[PDB]
């Protein structure tokens, strides 16, 4: 790529967007050569991988005394640091983890996870302040997008009715297909239903989502399943080795409604997501791959809570001093409040980070708890909410738990986040924290 030829991309203040179409080799070949160019020249470099899977891939033939790796971490002891998007945010929530680099390279910089938005927002702000060089690598950069970008090989894109979960008759083209398929679903619940029918038809299935990706994605090339039923987690560099993509073009849609994070209905994916889902196939020029979709894209995702959670993380990995931080360029329009609105002190920030790393709290719930609570062992907010926030158990009844002293309470949080009781998270897990374990 022309922009990264020579050394000009290394100067402080330079922002390089490596937006090559999928299959160009940006992750496994262009990035390691960028890292090795930074390493043999003694420049402090930060490399951000989307997930731990890709981190260990990035590791191969790079780690040593030159490149120092991190699995969220908190250890201090190395000019090139390679870590995940969330690990970068989590380390900057610490006083001991606010180190800076003169060159920063972020792979899959399109990820709309709040940690990724805050990570590229902070690095973009540092680059705009002439304090580091920034390289963003993604086939779908933030901005205007094409749902059908170029591929290395031909893709047959055809609109078809796609089952909304299980199906009993019809949709024969699904099971007749000779080859492996990647089926994108809006949620884990929908993916479970799709997987039931597929296994009933005698097909091998591997389900990929936010909780199973780090462990099960490795089994895809090993076992070569007929179908990979995945959420949007596979839009960030996953090589599923399939010849057909089935894409309902929908996604779950966490929104803050009436001070509560709701999980109702689905939204049409953005043009960037559909391009990334379609980008799973056509990766080279041999055969003709298939992209079966349904519906049109919707780029207006401003109402999603991920943008508020991104500013929540960005405000707490930055400091009141100096210039105000922003989201990456075009995404700044979606910052819901003025920056710094969610900044907490060092004491509340440790509680804020503890709820996320040790209690699996969402950034939204972790912030609301940390900013209104004074004692980290106090759990009274979990049962002092309004009657509308009462949580039902697996049997549909009220969730009753005993505090360590003997008192019986009903799960009723002041701040209700529906993501804590479904989509990978179990209501039992919230009870362990509520009951004081
Ligand atoms: Ni890639």
From Swiss-Prot:
N6-acetyllysine sites (modified residues): 211
Every Helicase ATP-binding domain range: 7-159
Site positions for Involved in NS3 ATPase and RTPase activities: 277, 280
Residues that coordinate or bind ATP: 20-27
Domain of life: Viruses
Topology Lumenal: residue spans: 1-437
Post-translational modification: Acetylated by host KAT5. Acetylation modulates NS3 RNA-binding and unwinding activities and plays an important positive role for viral replication.
Record domain Helicase C-terminal: where: 170-328
Topology of the protein relative to the lipid bilayer: Peripheral membrane protein
Localization annotation: Host endoplasmic reticulum membrane
Motif DEAH box: where in chain: 107-110
Subunit comment: Forms a heterodimer with NS2B. Interacts with non-structural protein 2A (via N-terminus). Interacts with NS4B. Interacts with unphosphorylated RNA-directed RNA polymerase NS5; this interaction stimulates RNA-directed RNA polymerase NS5 guanylyltransferase activity.
Annotated function: Displays three enzymatic activities: serine protease, NTPase and RNA helicase. NS3 serine protease, in association with NS2B, performs its autocleavage and cleaves the polyprotein at dibasic sites in the cytoplasm: C-prM, NS2A-NS2B, NS2B-NS3, NS3-NS4A, NS4A-2K and NS4B-NS5. NS3 RNA helicase binds RNA and unwinds dsRNA in the 3' to 5' direction.
Protein name: Serine protease NS3
Organism of provenance: Kyasanur forest disease virus
């Amino acid at each position: 790529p022309l922009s990264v030829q020579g050394t000009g991309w290394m100067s402080k203040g330079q922002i390089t967007v490596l937006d090559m179409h999928p299959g160009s080799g940006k992750t496994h070949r262009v990035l390691p050569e960028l890292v090795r160019q930074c390493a043999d020249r003694g420049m402090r470099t930060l490399v951000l991988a989307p997930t731990r899977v890709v981190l260990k891939e990035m590791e191969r033939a790079l780690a040593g005394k030159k490149v120092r790796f991190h699995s969220a971490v908190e250890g201090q002891t190395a000019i090139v640091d390679v870590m995940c998007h969330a690990t970068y945010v989590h380390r900057r929530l610490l006083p001991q983890g606010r180190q800076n680099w003169e060159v920063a390279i972020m792979d899959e910089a399109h990820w709309t996870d709040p940690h990724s938005i805050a990570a590229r927002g902070h690095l973009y702000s540092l680059a705009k302040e002439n304090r580091c060089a920034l390289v963003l690598m993604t086939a779908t950069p933030p901005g205007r997008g094409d749902p059908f970008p170029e591929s290395n090989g031909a893709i047959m894109s055809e609109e078809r009715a796609i089952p909304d979960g299980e199906w009993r008759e019809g949709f024969d083209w699904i099971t007749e297909y000779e080859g492996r398929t990647a089926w994108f679903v809006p949620s884990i619940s929908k993916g479970g239903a799709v997987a039931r029918t597929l296994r009933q038809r005698g097909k091998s299935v591997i389900c990929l989502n936010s909780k199973t990706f780090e462990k099960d994605y490795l089994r895809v090339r090993e076992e070569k399943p007929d179908f990979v039923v995945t959420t949007d987690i596979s839009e960030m560099g996953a090589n599923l080795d399939v010849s057909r993509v089935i894409d309902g073009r929908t996604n779950i849609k966490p929104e803050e409604v009436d001070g509560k994070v709701e999980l109702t209905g689905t939204r049409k994916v953005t043009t960037a997501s559909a391009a990334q889902r379609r980008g799973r196939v056509g990766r080279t020029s041999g055969r003709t791959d298939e992209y079966i979709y349904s519906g049109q894209c919707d780029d207006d995702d401003t109402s999603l809570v991920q943008w508020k959670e991104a500013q929540i993380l960005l405000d707490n990995i930055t400091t009141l001093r100096g210039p105000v931080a922003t989201f990456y360029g075009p995404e700044q329009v979606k910052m819901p409040e003025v920056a710094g609105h969610y900044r907490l002190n060092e004491e509340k920030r440790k509680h804020f980070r503890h709820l996320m790393t040790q209690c699996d709290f969402t950034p939204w719930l972790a912030w609301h708890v940390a900013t209104n609570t004074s004692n980290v062992l106090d759990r009274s907010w979990t049962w002092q909410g309004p009657e509308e926030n009462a949580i039902d158990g697996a049997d549909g009844d009220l969730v009753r738990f005993k505090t360590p002293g003997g008192s019986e309470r009903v799960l009723q949080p002041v701040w209700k986040d529906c993501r804590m009781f479904r989509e990978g998270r179990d209501v039992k897990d919230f009870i362990l924290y509520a009951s004081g374990r």
